[PDB]
Design a protein around this nucleic acid. Structure first.
Ligand SMILES: Cc1c(N2C[C@H]3C[C@@]3(N)C2)c(F)cc2c(CN)c(F)c(=O)n(C3CC3)c12
Ligand SMILES: Cc1c(N2C[C@H]3C[C@@]3(N)C2)c(F)cc2c(CN)c(F)c(=O)n(C3CC3)c12
Ligand SMILES: [Cl-]
Ligand SMILES: [Mg+2]
Ligand SMILES: [Mg+2]
Ligand SMILES: [Mg+2]
Ligand SMILES: [Mg+2]
Ligand SMILES: [Mg+2]
Lengths: 637, 702
DNA sequence: ACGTTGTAT
DNA sequence: GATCATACAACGTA
DNA sequence: GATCATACAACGTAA
DNA sequence: TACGTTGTAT
């Protein structure tokens, strides 16, 4: 009874049904459409605790799962008629459902075995990946109440599957274990590699697979090319589309988030703006992508930033390295979730942003932790990798000292230990205050030292080398950071890559991006010079050209025959303004043609010779490093 | 509780700051000097602690924490335990900041008189703009000061960037310190009360914060229509700007379009986003975001709530917005999904306010920051002020206008055009009265309704429609803004108390086919349900009354109570003015094109000479004007002519376009010359719009 | 004395 | 992303 | 519009 | 050894 749960009037377990909703917005919609005669609704605000390794008392401690036990009416000792798990048809809905299956299997085994647990099947357009078409349905929160009933609640038109067989009781209790075990993380990763009414063992496996693979590919793991996660990539592109360049005026962040959510990113607003705040804080990102006005947090409390309604943002000058060459046919374009617009799959990075800024993410079965590096050092290293492709990691380490965090603290890790980090791909680096380390709160540090001062462990402080060495190991003045160079490569699969594999693989992405840029510019220079050629022919024969237009009824074929010109050439003559007949506009055309002719052969030459293109890459990397590069902040020793 | 405390305890150097926004308060705590500055954010508005008792002030959590932080009890003469030296009221520079300040002054004047009289209360002056040109940075608390800085920088290289602060929440912590917190560069005025001014200060503030003295405030608005500062001069000017602001820029609607500013900025912003009735739905969060960033600098919740109301068919007679998702239900109108979940779009009825927008029919004023332009009104093809009606609460006055039927109001406007001497008695035969979005009947008599539309004020009553079937009462339609669940709870509560022992059961059969169906079963047929029904009409919400106060901002730009004849008569003046502006606008477009088409035909007839002039003369624009006696605007059209247009077919297309435009030229000039010809147009458009958007009467009158 | 209404904090 | 408490006019029922 | 609790991978810290 | 962190997600 207790709790914000809609109760049903009838008490006949044979006809009564209880529904567990994922979103509170969807729950409100479910309460409006439920049949009070035999339908009960309970909203589950947010995700539910993974009550698999939690004790019986711990399950009752969590407010969400506790209220679930009260509504169901069964205690976790296994001592309404149908309990239906109703969640959206998105990767999290399957995740929230799996967490509820783990709750019903371990603590309420009598409920799942008796057949009182159900799984609601919402439509996508057709729950499959459009497999029948070869022969968009908004989420439950965005669905109308009447549509939500015809889809999940109304028995005459719903799709409800009944969720442990006698022979499957062994595999159901074993499959879910490896899936929902915190320690069995390696068991889940190796399970994905192999994997790369309704049974409870078949549902949990398929459900957790879609979420595990989705979270890695479409959230936590970044793309090697632009070094951005999908949510990160969709933010920068939407800001460029909104005209929020470095020269434009600031715009309220709420509008930017609103467009990102409605256009490309169908997820929560808080998670999106938090990613925007991270890209804007100079103390969190080495080379921020966003510049904003207002309260964007402080080094002591990075989370103490004003709401998106009070802050105005705009892209930074550094962000131009990812979008300046976007519209020049350099990247593929895929449709968005609903398909009404197009989104770029990648961003043309003039510099390897994956190593410059670095990203730390947590996925299912795997994680990623990449530290930031200096711009001029990584740029000069990429230039050297173009000159001598056989360069070794030891030779590269001489150029790039190591990570460069947005702090003036010193890195105490030895050069020999750093070499092992970039060689094996995994490791940890340590920093010591000179300025506090990265993601170290100044206010928090004072509280730690004050507690030591209160106990009287350092009575001389109102000689310091001995005290400092003690505080480095006791307080946060010395902190380490784990390094796990994991990322989604060009092959579309995650893999741990060393420093040499990253720089080598990114230059392949850059050479491909430039090769696509040159083809784009070539077609514009060639077609324009092709159009201007016809104009001069028309200029020489304006008398005949104009006479043909005025006399002939349909001049499009006639113009092609009289001068042997192409259909596209004729349209340019027909679209010529009388103002262009002046002698000055002819000289302007003759001048424009002389310049364009020089550029035409250059693009075909660079695309033909690998040496000529490599010299360009070596030039662009140095040019971008001289403008956006900066000195080393955190020294390595 | 949530108060940042200072380490020092010296009252001579200690200062306390009261912030209006919690976001701004957090920013103030980051920039405060912990040595002697303490900050406490005041979430939301503060209780009007003028007529509240000393115990009531301690009951409200907001003001209670203020007394604890200050260290003085609401009993005067308690300054012996004061914690801080200076009490500063820090609020944003929008009209509410002056309101929040006045509410804090009322708290300090009545309950903490020792603080204000001793001179420990201060008023912070935040800046309105931030001008930066290079290393130099200046602030501008007033608009007259902003231009002064811009004019001063005109002699300096660079383009100054004028940054207007929407509020303390949008300011940087470092910027907030240099302006309000840092004593070396802040602007803090001392609010003191002289000995002789104590009588007027205690009297002036009373009329402003007195609940009963509402009429005294209304006549006060009509008449009103340094290091230290007196509190009677500050509170009077502060509350005046808020009182006038709320009337003009919030609650009271404009007679022309019948919309409040927030409503108009929503409908206009949606038209700019292409959200016409035919376009696809867009997430409401996007619409609200644009409305806030473009035109409406206020809270997001209050704006989206106004959008939701305009979309609910059970709240608006003719909704302006059509949406998908959970937009609430008649039982719980507030049970609507958040703006991030709902997608909206303008309704077909909204076309009556925007179809003529781009046709030069309304004035355009700049927005708050001046970067965009906003329409002052919307060209309403029908008087939306009476169709939808708006309920508002202002300072000193309020407005409550009920909805009416479209076809009835249109026919009344048509009749007033034909016979301008038509009386209200003749109009009441056309317009029965209010028409709510419910099938419940209006029980007010026609004679009592006539007094409502004549005096402008009054009240109407509605009663639920019911019919007893199978010996049991069945309620089919409830009054307007009457919740079915609330009605059932009231009747059930009476059943629980034993005040209705004759009724057997109380069921709610409301389904998707029948919107409202409440059944009341008696214990026997001998029980008279007519006697029980009459009791429930007086006991439950089955019978509800609605206040009527036809107050609105007229064309003269001033609020006034207007009767039914003054509304339709004043709107027809607004409509005739907008149509007269539409025709002049289209006329000027037809004239300018005919002036351009004239030059093209001249060029076609002398194409040989025209081209020869272009090739020979370096700049042919003047030569063309002299050789053919054509105008500069005509020459530019000739120069921008494509060679394809020299074909004989494209000439015939222009001669045909001219023959049609010449017909449209004389037609518009004829309607603009004769008032009778224009009245027949208005009489036609009103009937045309009524046949398309009009609908039957929903709430019957009996 | 309370409780409504709707734009505002 | 549901939950809190206020201003303002003013009438209607407990 | 500040405040609430969870999933997911594994380092470090003092236990 | 459980516990605290980290950042996109509900
Ligand atoms: C309701 C929800 C929370 N509830 C509170 C408690 C019942 C819970 N177990 C889940 C929460 F604690 C935090 C949030 C946050 C904060 N990052 C959100 F941005 C947000 O949009 N949601 C909803 C998208 C889930 C939140
Ligand atoms: C914080 C705030 C509320 N608190 C709750 C309790 C601390 C208080 N004394 C004030 C509230 F009860 C409601 C709101 C609403 C809802 N109409 C807002 F839109 C909003 O932006 N704020 C702030 C603009 C004021 C709200
Ligand atoms: Cl035209
Ligand atoms: Mg979802
Ligand atoms: Mg404000
Ligand atoms: Mg709500
Ligand atoms: Mg309210
Ligand atoms: Mg967290």
């Amino acid at each position: 009874l207790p709790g914000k749960l809609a109760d049903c009037t009838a008490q006949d377990l044979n006809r009564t049904e209880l529904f567990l909703v994922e979103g509170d917005s969807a729950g409100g919609s479910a309460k409006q459409a439920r049949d009070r005669e035999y339908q009960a609704i309970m909203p589950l605000k947010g995700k539910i605790l993974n009550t698999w390794e939690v004790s019986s008392d711990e399950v009752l401690a969590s407010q969400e799962v506790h209220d679930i036990s009260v509504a169901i009416g069964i205690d976790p000792d296994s001592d309404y008629g149908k309990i239906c798990i109703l969640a959206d048809a998105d990767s999290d809905g399957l995740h929230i459902a799996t967490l509820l299956c783990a709750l019903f299997v371990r603590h309420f085994r009598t409920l799942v075995k008796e057949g009182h647990v159900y799984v609601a099947l919402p439509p996508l357009y057709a729950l499959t990946e459009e497999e029948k078409t070869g022969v968009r349905f908004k989420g439950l929160g965005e669905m109308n109440p009447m549509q939500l009933r015809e889809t999940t609640l109304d028995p005459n038109t719903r799709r409800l599957v009944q969720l442990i067989s006698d022979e499957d009781e062994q595999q159901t209790t074993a499959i879910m274990d490896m899936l929902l075990a915190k320690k069995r993380s390696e068991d889940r990763r190796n399970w994905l590699q192999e994997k790369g009414r309704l049974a409870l063992h078949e549902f949990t496996e398929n459900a957790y697979l879609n979420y595990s693979m989705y979270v890695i590919m479409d959230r936590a793991l970044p793309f090697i090319g632009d070094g951005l996660k999908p949510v990160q990539r969709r933010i920068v592109y939407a800001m460029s589309e909104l005209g929020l360049n470095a020269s434009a005026k600031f715009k309220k962040s709420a509008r930017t988030v609103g467009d990102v959510l409605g256009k490309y990113h169908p997820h929560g607003d808080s998670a999106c703006y938090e990613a925007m705040v991270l890209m804007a804080q100079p103390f969190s990102y080495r080379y921020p992508l966003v510049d904003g006005q207002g309260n964007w947090g402080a080094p002591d409390d990075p989370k103490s930033f004003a709401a998106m309604r009070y802050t105005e943002s705009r892209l930074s000058k550094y962000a131009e390295l990812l979008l300046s060459e976007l519209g020049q046919g350099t990247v593929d374009w895929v449709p968005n979730f609903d398909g009404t617009l197009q989104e770029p799959k990648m961003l043309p990075a003039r510099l390897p942003n994956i190593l410059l800024n670095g990203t730390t993410g947590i996925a299912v079965g795997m994680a990623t932790d990449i530290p930031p590096h200096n711009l001029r050092e990584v740029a000069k290293a990429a230039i050297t990798l173009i000159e001598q492709p056989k360069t070794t990691l030891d030779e590269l380490l001489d150029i790039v000292q190591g990570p460069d965090f947005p702090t003036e603290a010193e890195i105490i890790t030895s050069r020999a230990e750093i070499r092992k980090i970039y060689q094996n791909g995994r490791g940890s680096v340590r920093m010591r205050a000179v300025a506090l380390p990265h993601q170290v709160s100044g206010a928090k540090v004072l509280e730690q030292i004050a507690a030591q001062m209160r106990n009287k462990k350092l009575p001389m402080v109102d000689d310091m080398e001995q005290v400092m060495n003690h505080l480095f190991a006791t307080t946060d003045l010395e902190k380490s950071y784990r390094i796990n160079l994991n990322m989604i490569g060009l092959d579309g699969r995650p893999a741990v890559k060393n420093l040499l594999e990253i720089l080598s693989e990114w230059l392949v992405f850059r050479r491909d991006t430039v090769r696509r840029r040159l083809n784009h510019r070539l077609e514009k220079v060639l077609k324009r010079l092709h159009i201007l050629e016809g104009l001069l022919v028309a200029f020489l024969n304006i008398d005949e050209v104009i006479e043909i237009i005025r006399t002939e009824d349909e001049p499009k074929p006639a113009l092609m025959s009289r001068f042997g010109i192409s259909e596209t050439q004729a349209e340019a003559i027909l679209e010529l303004k009388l103002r262009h007949l002046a002698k000055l506009e002819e000289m302007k055309i003759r001048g424009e043609q002389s310049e364009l002719e020089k550029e035409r052969d250059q693009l075909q030459a660079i695309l033909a010779s690998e040496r000529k293109m490599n010299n360009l890459l070596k030039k662009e990397l140095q040019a971008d490093a001289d403008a956006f590069g900066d000195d080393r902040r955190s020294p390595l020793h």
